[PDB]
Structure formats: C-alpha cells, structure tokens
Design a protein around this nucleic acid. Structure first.
Lengths: 50, 62, 52, 174, 99, 126
RNA sequence: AGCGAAUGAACUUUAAAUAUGUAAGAAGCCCUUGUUACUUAACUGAACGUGGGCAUUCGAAUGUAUCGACACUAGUGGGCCAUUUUUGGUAAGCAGAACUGGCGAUGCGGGAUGAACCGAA
C-alpha cells in the first residue's frame, strides 16, 4: 500500500516535471528537447509467409 | 530515504534485523549493484553505505 | 478457476492493488493543476511560428 | 491528403566536439500528424543537404493554427510537381478560410486534373493575397467580382436512400 | 497497466500462469524486489535494473484484432497511410483497439 | 610475413599473382591456418550450404594471406578489465565492467539566441 | 562532404547505404621459470611442466520446451516457377550462374474461374 502511494506520487511528479521544463524553456526562449523513449511495445501483425 | 530514494521497506518479523537485508537489497537495486542473474549484491550495497557514511554523505549526531 | 479482469471486478482491483480504494476516495485522477498566472508567450516565439 | 495540420519543425545536426551548436534548421510541413511531419522533414533535409536522421535530432515540433479561421480569404500556391516528363512549375489560386484547407483543396485539384500524387507534389510556397487585384485566375476572380448573387437551379432534393417508393414525383425547385 | 492487468500471464516453470495474485508475483520475482503487480508495472513503464527479468517473466501478450479494424490497406508504412512501422504515441490507441 | 599453424588470417586475393588463386566466394574472407608450405598456406574456412555449415580446406599463398586483426579487441578488453578490476578492488569502489548498447539520448535544451533558425524550402532556389 | 584541409573511382580529414567474413573468458589471459625428440643467432617459436589474480556484473543485447557423444535402425536422394544480383546475345526472343521465397507431403477467404497472384495456416 505505502509503496504504491509512492509510485503514484512519482508518476505525477515526472509528468508535471516534464511539463514544467517545457514551459520554462518556452518562457526562456529556448526549446527543451524531450528525452527519447526507452520502452517500446511491438506487435507482430503480419503472418510468416514469403 | 531522501538520499537513497528507497521506497518504503517491509520491516518483516521484529525490527532492525531483516530490515537491514531489505535496505541492502533496495540500495543495491538503486545504485546498480546487481549480481549475475539480477540478484542484488547486499555486500556491495552495504560497503557502499559504509563508505558514504565515512565520507559524510549521510547526516547523524549523538 | 476463472480469471477476472480487475477493471470490471473492482473487488479483484482491491485484492491486487490496496491503494485503489484510497485513490478513488481522494480523487487523484482529476487533480487540479497548480494555480498562478501563466507567463505570456514571447513575441519572438510568435514571430518564429508565423515566420514564413 | 486527409485532415492536414501545419507543423513548424526545427531540427539540427547532433552536437560534435569539432562542430558544436549547429544552425538549427526549420521548415513548415503539411502532414496528417507529427510522425509524418518528421518523416517529411528528414526527407527534405536529406534531399537538399547531407544532414540525415541518424546524425540529427528534431528539437521542436509545433502546430501553426490559422490566425483567423473565421475569415474567407484568397491563397496563391506555388508548386513543383514531377510528371513522366519532368518537374513542372505551377501557381494556382484557391478560396478558403485556412492554410490547411487551401492545401487540401490543392491536393484534391492536383489529383483530379493532373493525376499528381503526394509523393510527386512538392509544396514550394503558399501565400495569402493581402489585397485584391493580386488575383490572376478567372475561377477566383469571378467569386471576387463585386456584388455576387446567383441562383442554384436544378437542386435535387435530399430524399433518403431507404425510401425506395415515393407517392409524389419530386420537384427540383428548391 | 491495462496490458498487465487484463492479459497478464507469467512464465512459471515454463507454464503460462495468469497473474492473479501478488503472492504469485512475489514467488516468481521476489529475488529482484518485485512483490506486486504495481511493482511490475513500474518496472516496465519506467525501465529499471531488472527489466530484462520482468520482460522475460511476462509471457508474450496475445492481442485480439482491433475493434474498428485496421486502415483500408494495413500493409504499408505508417507515414504512407499504412499500419507497419513506428507509430510512436498512436500505438496507445492501437492497444486500446486490440486489447 | 610469417605464419604459424593455428593463427587467424584474412584472405584478400590481389590480382597480381595468378598461381593458386582461391574462388571469389573465398575472396575477402577469414580463416585459420592448418598447413604451412613453402609458398602456400592451408586454411580451414567455413562455407554455407542451405541450413548447415561445412568446413572447407583451401590453399592460399603468402601474397594474399595476411594476419587477421580481430582478436586484438578481445585481448585489449581482457587486459583493461583485469587492470580496472585491480584498481576497483584496491580503492574499494565498484566499476562497471560490461559493455552497454549505447542507450538512447537524454533530454537537453538549446538556445535560439545567436542561433536564429533558418527557414528552408523543399528545393533550394538561389 | 570538403578541397575558405593537403594532393589530385584512381583527390582525401571524415565517411556512407547495402549485404557479407572472424572474435566477444574460467575449457580464459598474461608474462615468469625450466626440458625437449622439433625449431631458431637465441623459452626465438611449439608442447610439457610452475605462478598470479579475479567465482555475491565471470567481463555486450535478445532468445532458453536444453546440449554434447557413441552405438544401432528405415525412407530419400527429382525438379518447376518467381524476386534480386550477375554474364552473354538477338530485330525481338532468350541462354547461363548465386541467394531467397513458393509448390513439391497443405486444408481455408479473395482475384467471376485456374500449379506459380494476395491474406492466412
């Protein structure tokens, strides 16, 4: 229970942190380049022929 | 907790005895002191904590 | 004997994630954003969008 | 090509010790979404200069909303499409309320009259005609003509396709 | 969260066991400090030291056909109107359709 | 150049010498020496057939066999890892010994000032 | 790309795409010390013996329904089509190699219909 509380807090902190950094760069007249994604979901959708 | 993140421990039966083991596991997970198959290196985590305490990375007084 | 999706069986949601009850109770899914008057957009920024 | 969006995309070469702080190139791309916008951006950069996707990063992508969506206005678009013979330049005029709508009508007209595809059309420039008399095309200047008032003869009324049988014969005076 | 909750199956001794209990989660991933499905979700979402173990334990998700269907011709790249390739954040809507 | 029996050598096949030339499938390959003769060298090299591999034995001579430059990385890695582990154990600090796959880049900021972005056209006119 | 770097595909600081060879520890490394029937001016090499370190990141990622050996036991050892690359030739046909894929032992939806098409077993 307590650890899940902490995890939810961390998720919200990360989201508002990214938003805040973007706004700070916008106000300072620069562009903050988002960090590249580290996880991808891959779904095979084509059958194995040819 | 603030210094090493360390999400809340399971103190387990009694207090102070196996909480050290949980603390070492969490510190090894955070730092990156993992073993061969991912098992945390409790010895490495403990020695890192000892070195940090010696170097004054943690606060404390009597 | 019968797998139940927690999103439909909230009871399984309670079993697997004890934090769900307090999450729903305190409404963390619609948290208000922090207040404060937003700074205005730079005129240089606007000109950069409307450059060409 | 679909409900388009105008994207201001700024990209740059990856930083190097020999050459830090590149020139931060910019373009305007009409694409259905951001991924297509970035793909178009990298295509144009590799077609023009040596900078490629592997050696560059997109530092900014933004939407350029039309300034006055509620104003009908005149657009002139300079285009360079590629046909079987070769590259041919054209300048076409359109009447819409937004740049994205002008580009969509542009693509529709190009496909309809010259069989030009998205891969074959290069959008060189689009401009709002600031003042009248910059219209050169009759099919826009006729709408620009003063005091336009016309009827709509032979209006086929909308009868539901599921009403197979009609007791009275339709009239086409509405 | 939806993929782990709705279609969560773990590899337990080579057996596709549905992840219906935090006790099962702890028994399979206790050595890495993962003791709950929320811990597994955090590991996957914010990839950590034991993401290899977490992903290997997680059985390949068997997704259903998307509700509403694919695009008219799905066997092109995304940038050219198809469905193949890297769709970045639209994979979320794709998972909504399939799951 | 000199070659012992058992070392890794590359096959390049220069066009100057026509005597005992290996095949174009063998041009630019890598193998291990198993015979050394007066002028030619016996090499065991794998060749690919459908699903399996079959090791063929070919005689390629000194003008076109050259020593391989492959295992030097393995030797350098083992020496560097041994030395780095020595400093690690001596100084009581942990050092990362494996190779990482060059993870994706992190976030950063770039300043428009002194760097006004230049707008470009689909084709350059000038 | 540059040649506001030198020189001039045969120019190059750099460096593609693209497939294609070899290696990524504990059965592994290094050197030390000796013998030898071999070798070299000579532990110079080769093998045989010593020594050390590092087993809770033993030295990339992913995959893990296991792998290695010996012994024994049947049936098989035809080709056709196409992609790409490649060589030669004609007026046009075409002919020859290599890879991969499909049919050969394969049912099912679609192309009105079908050995060589699309999807999918």
């Amino acid at each position: 229970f307590k650890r899940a509380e902490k995890y939810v807090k961390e998720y919200r902190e990360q989201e508002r942190e990214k938003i805040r950094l973007a706004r700070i760069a916008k106000q300072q007249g620069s562009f903050h380049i988002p960090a590249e994604a580290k996880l991808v979901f891959v779904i095979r959708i084509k059958g194995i022929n040819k | 907790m603030q210094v090493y993140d360390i999400p809340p421990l399971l103190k387990d039966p009694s207090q102070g005895g196996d909480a050290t083991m949980d603390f070492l596991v969490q510190v090894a997970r955070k730092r990156g002191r993992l073993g061969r198959g991912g098992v945390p290196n409790i010895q490495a985590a403990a020695m890192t904590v000892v070195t940090d305490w010696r170097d004054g990375r943690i606060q404390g007084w009597t | 004997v019968q797998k139940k999706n927690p999103l439909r069986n909230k009871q399984i949601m309670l079993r697997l994630n004890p934090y769900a009850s307090t999450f729903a109770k305190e409404k963390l899914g619609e948290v208000k954003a922090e207040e404060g008057k937003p700074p205005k957009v730079p005129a240089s920024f606007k000109e950069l969008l409307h450059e060409a | 090509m679909g409900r388009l969006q105008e994207y201001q995309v700024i990209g740059r070469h990856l930083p190097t010790e020999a050459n830090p702080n590149p020139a931060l190139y910019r373009m305007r791309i009409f694409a259905p979404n951001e991924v297509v916008a970035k793909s178009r951006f990298w295509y144009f950069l590799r077609g023009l200069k040596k900078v490629k996707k592997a050696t560059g990063e997109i530092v900014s992508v933004n939407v350029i909303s039309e300034k006055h969506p509620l104003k009908v206005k005149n657009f002139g678009i300079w285009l360079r499409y590629d046909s079987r013979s070769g590259t041919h330049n054209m300048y076409k005029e359109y009447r819409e309320t937004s740049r994205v709508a002008a580009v969509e009508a542009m693509y529709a007209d190009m496909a309809a009259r010259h069989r030009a595809r998205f891969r074959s059309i290069h959008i060189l420039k689009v401009v709002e005609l600031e003042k009248t008399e910059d219209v050169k095309r009759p099919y826009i200047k006729q709408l620009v003509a003063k005091n336009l008032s016309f009827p709509l003869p032979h209006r086929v009324p909308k009868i539901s396709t599921k009403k197979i049988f009609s007791a009275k014969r339709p009239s086409t005076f509405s | 969260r939806e993929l782990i909750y709705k279609r969560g199956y773990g590899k337990v001794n080579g057996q596709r066991i549905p992840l219906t209990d935090n006790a099962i989660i702890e028994e399979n991933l206790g050595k890495y400090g993962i003791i709950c499905i929320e811990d597994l979700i955090h590991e996957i979402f914010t990839v950590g030291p034991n993401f290899k173990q977490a992903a290997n334990f997680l059985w390949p998700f068997k997704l259903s056909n998307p509700n509403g269907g694919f695009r008219p011709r799905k066997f092109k790249h995304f940038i050219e109107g198809g469905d193949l390739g890297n769709r970045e954040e639209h994979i979320n809507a794709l998972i909504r359709a399939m799951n | 150049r000199t070659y012992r029996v058992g070392d890794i050598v590359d096959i390049k096949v220069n066009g100057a010498v026509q005597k005992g030339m290996p095949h174009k499938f063998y041009h630019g390959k890598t193998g291990v020496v198993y015979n050394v003769t007066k002028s030619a060298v016996g090499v065991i090299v794998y060749k690919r057939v459908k699903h399996r591999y079959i090791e063929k034995r070919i005689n390629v001579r000194i003008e076109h066999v050259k020593p391989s430059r492959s295992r030097e990385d393995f030797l350098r890695r083992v020496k560097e890892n041994a030395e780095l582990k020595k400093k690690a154990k001596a100084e009581g600090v942990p050092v990362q010994l494996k190779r990482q796959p060059a993870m994706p880049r992190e976030a950063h900021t770039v300043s428009i000032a002194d760097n006004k972005p230049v707008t470009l056209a689909p084709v350059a006119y000038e």
